[model samples]
Target: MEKKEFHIVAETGIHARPATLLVQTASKFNSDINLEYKGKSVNLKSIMGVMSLGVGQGSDVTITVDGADEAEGMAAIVETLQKEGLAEQ
Candidate 1:
């Protein structure tokens, strides 16, 4: 598995729009992806699971990706977080 850390950059945290983008991005791969925070792990492909964390801006999260493209998957996730979904419209 590949593990990478990212901090939520949106002031709104993982709400409807950002959560949607996160889940969608996570769904694109075959790897098993999960987001971890405060000793809790949530399925990255599930909107409810992600939003349940109430991970606000600046909250740190560790993304764990396992399976074939784990490294690439982690890279993509971190990249998106780094750009905050390109400051999505």
Candidate 2:
């Protein structure tokens, strides 16, 4: 398993539109990906779960990717996250 913390860049945090796109990226991965913030880790693919974090801008998220394609999955998410304006290093 690989884990990295990403700072939430958008004011919306993991908001609706970005979450939708992010979830789509996560869905394409064989590796399991999740969002951990505050105290809970939620599956990124679940819009409700991800949104429930209420993690606003300037907050951070710990992303965990585990399984076969961990590298690709992790890279994909990190890239897509930037593209979506949801996170940064």
Candidate 3:
């Protein structure tokens, strides 16, 4: 498994819109991806689960990737977050 933490820097945070797009990106991967926040974790592929975290601006999130495509999945997720201006290294 591969894991990384990111700080959400967007003013709006990981709200509905960004969560939806993130989920779409996660869904394309064959690996299992999850996001952890505030001691709670949820499947990254589920929009509802991702939003349930209430990941406001400046929130720190840990992403975990496991399974066959872990490397690609992690890279895609990081890229998506960067492209959306949602998170920082």
Candidate 4:
């Protein structure tokens, strides 16, 4: 398993568009991906789960990836978050 902390920097957080993109990215990997915030954890590949987190700007989140492709999945997720300006530098 791999774990990393991230801060939401996007003004809109993980709303519809970014949630969709996040789900798509996570679904491509065999690894089990989840996001945890405020003592709650949800599947990263589920749009509804992500949106339910209400991850607003400045919120801290932890990403967990486990499986054969965990490394690649983790990298892709981090890259996506950075590229989309959803995560802090």
Please report the candidate that would top lDDT against the real structure: 2
Give the 10-residue window scoring lowest on summed lDDT in candidate 4: 18-27
Q: Which ten residues in a row have the lowest lDDT in candidate 3?
A: 19-28
Off by over 4 Å in 1: 85-89
Residues 1-89 of candidate 2: C-alpha lDDT, one tens digit per residue: 88656766775756667765666776677888776777567677766777667465767776778887678877777877676667786
lDDT of 1 by residue, 1-89 (tens): 77665666675677666665554665566787677766566776666766567465666666778887576676567677665642222
Q: Give the Cα-based TM-score of candidate 2 against the true structure.
A: 0.82
Off by over 4 Å in 2: none
What would the per-residue lDDT of candidate 4 be over residues 8-86, giving only the tens digit for each residue?
Answer: 6676767767765555665677897666666566676665766667575667676667897688876777777676776
Q: Supply candidate 4's per-residue lDDT for 87.
A: 62
Point out where model 3 deviates above 4 Å: none
Model 4, residue 45: C-alpha shift (Å): 2.5
| lDDT of model 4, residue 63 | 66
* Cα lDDT listed for each candidate: 0.63, 0.70, 0.69, 0.68
RMSD in Å for candidate 4, one decimal? 1.8
Q: What pairs collide in candidate 2?
A: none
Candidate 3, residues 1-89: lDDT per residue as tens digits?
77756656665767777765555666667887667767556676566767568575777777777877678876777777677776666
Q: What's the residue-level lDDT of 72 in candidate 1?
A: 67
lDDT for model 2: 0.70
